[PDB]
A paper describes a structure:
To obtain the structure of a more complete version of the protein, we expressed [name] trimmed of its N- and C-terminal extensions from other yeast species. Of these, [name] containing residues 88–1035 from [name] (Zr [name]) yielded crystals suitable for crystallography. Diffraction data were obtained to a resolution of 2.6 Å from crystals grown at pH 6.5 in a PEG/KSCN condition and their structure solved by selenomethionine single-wavelength anomalous dispersion (SAD). The crystal structure of Zr [name] reveals a long, partly twisted and partly crescent-shaped protein composed entirely of α-helices stacked on each other in a surprisingly irregular manner, given the repeat nature of the protein. In addition to a pronounced hook within the protein’s C-terminal half, a striking feature is a “nose” at the N-terminal end, a morphology generated by a pair of anti-parallel helices that are about twice as long as their neighbors. At the tip of the nose reside three conserved basic residues, KKR (298–300). Though part of this conserved and essential surface (‘CES’) is positively charged, it also contains numerous conserved aromatic residues, namely Zr H337, F339, Y373, W376, and F417. The highly conserved positively charged residues Zr K340, K372, and R416 all protrude from the surface in a conspicuous manner. Though S. cerevisiae [name] packed tightly as dimers in the crystals, those from [name] crystallized as monomers.
Sister chromatid cohesion involves entrapment of sister DNAs by a cohesin ring created through association of a kleisin subunit (Scc1) with ATPase heads of Smc1/Smc3 heterodimers. Cohesin’s association with chromatin involves subunits recruited by Scc1: Wapl, Pds5, and [name]/SA, in addition to Scc2/4 loading complex. Because all eukaryotic genomes encode orthologs, [name] is the most important of cohesin’s regulatory subunits. It has roles in loading of cohesin onto chromosomes as well as its subsequent release.
Residue numbers in the entry: 88 to 225, 235 to 397, 408 to 581, 605 to 753, 761 to 838, 849 to 1022
Write the structure that this text describes.
């Protein structure tokens, strides 16, 4: 029965705050010192009642319903058993709010917003006020003994909550005791020893005063020992077991508090005996713990030397291999200071500095993890660089000046560029082979992230790059060969680009550094090299007008552009595919347009105009063959098409006729007499562009436009005359490669022009009984018999080119050329499959507007099942 009733009360009991809990959990402006004076005074009056209130406060903070009674705490030999019973009661409670930590992590949502701050303040000062009331020293005071007797068993029990709050109470005690021991030393005993040593002479030692000094010096040291005694204990009872608690949060509190003991009291704590704890938890399975140790190490940076000798390896491994990027990044940050300190071997340095190179696109403006990780690697790189500089210049005196800049600058640039290249070489070993293109793009990117550290070298890199003399002197990577120049300009371009996309930077800064040298750079770099052309034009294209006027260099833009146009003029351009030059020039032309200055536009408008004039010359003089097409395309047609993307190109009746009659319509005869490599570069892309510009006129209205219609009608007739020649039984070159290539490239431009025309025609209102009538007048039917026949032959060539790669057996119409069974062609950029799909897509596009002979082109489906999944997809 007695037991029944106890079980009964246990069951119907609900959560009731104790008095001390209430004041601590709800007071928003509390004098915690007055509070402690009251409680600690009560200890001396009624020990049991204080102890009870203390533990019940702990129980309230964990949201426990259970409570001790004054008799429960009467005996200190009961403590383990009683905590045992509390543990039983608290395990039985199904639901429990951890108020202390809800206050901490969720003040806004918490029933007791101030509870956490008050609780840590209270337990942190507890032991100070104890001292004020002479409860601490008295041999250890029984206050302390009492407190440890109950905190110890609670700190190792099976309830995480009780374990956390006891451990935190113990640690808060130690925050103070550790401060207090040194306090006693440096501020009391030291002050009294001095005055024990100065009141010794002159042969007049006060003797009664030399007795009062040894007296309090002896008291104070006795109490320094009682204090260290409790410090030893809390380590022995708590930290040494709690640092590896199964709960990660008690482990991180252990690291946070040990760091404080270390700052408070290094003579006790700055020793490998305690630092190992950080190093061990470096291998903790929890991301949170590894993060927490890693944030503590910088603060902590001979005990420390021994520490990094023992743990740097693990720190390196984290920065390289850790499953968590935020952690990896933290590691790199620690490695900054280890390097700064000389604790890193050279191979260990490279393994980190080469991390600045990464295959993935990482944006320099982002606040993401990836971006912040590269940024902390750039920080490491910056520090290695500075160390090497000091090491290099340590004995040396350099000249006031090397290679047109301060000696010290030239060295810094040479050391930087050298580490950049050593680092790259490492990166490149750590991964599968990549081509020069990807190589440059990855370097370009690293340079972006280095802008915050090497940005002040931008001006001197420009000047070093325009130096005419030899790169030596009585003593480093310098722009001495062609690979080193490319490294320099890519790195200049990446630095500069990174500087204009860096967030939070004031306007015009990168421009203040490069625009003064930009004319000289274009005037002097080896821009015949497309890699060098790409980097310098890329620098040019970084800047908006506001950049040029601000810097005072708006005046230079035209002379620079003139150089750009002369380099444009001196080159030979290919049809655009994978041509680094075509791409650089194209972007430059766009950029200039985008600046919006008529004076500049005119430089390009006049260039188009000269090109036209000279083409007409070439046309009437030279076409009255491999050389002819080489020149035609290399010096005239590919360049008008490039410029044509940005500025209007129009052939006037005269030139257009010259071009259509002497070239375009004679393409079949011209082609039979060229070499393969020359046939490969034959196309009519310019004809599609001329058209597009006219279509632009027509849409920039919607009253028809005459000669503008005569122009495109005439361009299309030209396509017809080719298709007639090409599809006729008189074509003795039918069936050959060269014949396929011409049919194919001619078809691609034709399809683009016709689709463009039909989409326009359908976008004119019935309202427009003059436009609609004139379009059908000139173009309908859009695709003629011979055009249908050529597109089908082109399709069939591509289909067998892809089929044959796997020796697939195609079905065929009865008079379908069976020689298609043997065709082979290695000449396509990204493979036969790609060209089959694209052509078939262009054919689908026509079919959807229904411009194709549906009966004829049913044929594209005959082998859908033989051609793989993609083709089959495009057919659906």
């Amino acid at each position: 029965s007695k037991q029944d009733q106890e079980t009964y009360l246990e069951t119907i009991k609900d959560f009731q705050p104790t008095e001390l809990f209430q004041v601590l959990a709800t007071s928003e402006d509390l004098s915690i010192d007055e509070l402690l004076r009251d409680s600690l005074e009560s200890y001396s009056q009624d020990r049991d009642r204080f102890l009870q209130e203390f533990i019940n406060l702990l129980l309230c903070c964990c949201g426990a319903i259970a409570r001790l009674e004054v008799h429960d705490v009467h005996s200190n030999e009961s403590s383990n058993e009683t905590v045992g019973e509390l543990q039983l009661l608290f395990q039985r409670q199904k639901v429990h709010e951890f108020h202390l930590l809800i206050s901490k992590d969720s003040k806004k949502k918490s029933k007791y917003p101030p509870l956490y701050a008050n609780f840590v303040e209270f337990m942190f000062r507890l032991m100070d006020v104890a001292n004020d009331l002479q409860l601490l020293y008295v041999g250890t005071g029984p206050l302390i003994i009492d407190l440890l007797t109950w905190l110890s068993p609670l700190s190792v029990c099976k309830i995480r909550s009780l374990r956390y709050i006891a451990t935190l109470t113990l640690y808060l005690f130690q925050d103070f005791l550790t401060d207090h021991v040194v306090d006693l030393d440096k501020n009391y005993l030291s002050k009294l020893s001095k005055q024990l040593s100065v009141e010794n002479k002159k042969k007049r030692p006060n003797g009664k005063t030399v007795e009062k000094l040894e007296s309090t010096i002896a008291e104070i040291q006795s109490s320094k020992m009682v204090t260290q005694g409790i410090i030893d204990n809390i380590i022995k009872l708590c930290f040494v077991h709690r640092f590896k608690d199964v709960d990660e949060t008690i482990r991180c509190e252990s690291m946070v508090h040990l760091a404080s003991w270390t700052k408070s009291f290094p003579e006790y704590f700055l020793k490998v005996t305690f630092l190992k704890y950080f190093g061990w938890l470096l291998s903790d399975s929890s991301v949170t713990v590894r993060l927490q140790v890693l944030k503590i190490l910088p603060q902590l940076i001979s005990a420390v030397r021994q520490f990094f000798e023992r743990f740097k390896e693990r720190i390196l491994e984290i920065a390289l291999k850790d499953s968590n990027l935020e952690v990896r990044l933290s590691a790199v940050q620690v490695l900054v200071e280890v390097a700064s300190l000389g604790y890193l071997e050279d191979t260990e340095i490279l393994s980190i500095s080469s991390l600045i190179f990464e295959d993935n696109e990482i944006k320099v403006s982002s606040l993401g993890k990836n971006s912040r990780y590269l940024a902390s690697v750039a920080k490491f790189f910056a520090c290695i660089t500075e160390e090497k500089f000091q090491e290099f210049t340590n004995n040396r005196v350099l000249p006031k000046e090397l290679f047109d800049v301060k000696g010290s600058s030239a060295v810094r640039i040479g050391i930087f560029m050298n580490l950049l290249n050593e680092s790259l070489t490492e990166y490149l070993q750590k991964v599968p082979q990549i081509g020069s293109e990807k190589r440059i793009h990855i370097l370009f990117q690293a340079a972006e992230f280095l802008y915050p550290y090497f940005g002040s070298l931008i001006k001197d890199i420009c000047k070093v790059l325009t130096f005419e003399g030899e790169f030596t002197h009585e003593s480093l990577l310098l722009p001495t060969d062609s690979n080193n120049i490319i490294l320099y300009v890519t790195t200049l371009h990446g630095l500069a680009y990174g500087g204009t996309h860096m967030r939070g930077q004031p306007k015009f800064k990168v421009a203040e550094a490069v625009l003064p040298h930009l004319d000289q750079l274009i005037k002097r770099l080896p821009i015949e090299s497309s890699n060098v052309l790409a980097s310098i034009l890329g620098v040019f294209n970084l800047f908006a007008f506001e950049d040029w006027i601000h810097t005072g260099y708006e005046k230079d833009i035209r002379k620079i552009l003139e150089k750009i146009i002369k380099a444009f003029n001196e080159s030979t351009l290919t049809s655009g595919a994978q041509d680094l030059k075509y791409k650089s020039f194209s972007e430059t032309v766009s950029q200039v347009r985008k600046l919006g200055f008529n004076e500049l536009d005119e430089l390009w408008l006049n260039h188009i105009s000269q090109l036209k004039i000279h083409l007409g010359k070439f046309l009437e003089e030279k076409l009255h063959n491999d050389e002819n097409m080489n020149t035609l395309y290399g010096v005239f047609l590919n360049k008008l098409a490039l410029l044509g993307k940005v500025y209007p190109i129009e052939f006037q009746e005269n030139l257009l006729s010259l071009f259509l009659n002497r070239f375009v319509q004679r393409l079949p005869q011209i082609g039979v007499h060229c070499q393969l490599e020359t046939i490969q570069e034959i196309h009519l892309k310019l004809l599609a562009l001329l058209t597009t510009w006219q279509l632009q006129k027509w849409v920039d209205i919607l009253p028809v436009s005459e000669f503008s219609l005569r122009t495109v009608s005439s361009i299309v007739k030209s396509f017809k005359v080719i298709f007639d020649a090409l599809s006729s039984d008189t074509n003795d070159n039918d069936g050959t490669l060269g014949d396929f290539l011409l049919k194919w490239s001619t078809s691609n431009s034709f399809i683009d022009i016709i689709i463009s025309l039909k989409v326009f025609e359908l976008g004119v209102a019935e309202s427009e009984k003059s436009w609609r009538h004139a379009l059908r007048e000139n173009f309908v039917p859009y695709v003629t018999d011979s055009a249908n026949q050529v597109l089908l032959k082109v399709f069939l060539y591509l289909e067998s080119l892809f089929a044959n790669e796997s020796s697939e057996h195609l079905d065929r119409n009865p008079q379908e050329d069976v020689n298609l069974n043997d065709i082979k062609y290695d000449g396509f950029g990204d493979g036969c499959e790609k060209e089959l799909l694209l052509f078939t897509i262009k054919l689908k596009g026509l079919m959807k507007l229904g411009l194709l002979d549906e009966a004829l082109f049913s044929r594209i489906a005959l082998n859908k099942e033989k051609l793989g999944p993609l083709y089959a997809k495009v057919i659906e």
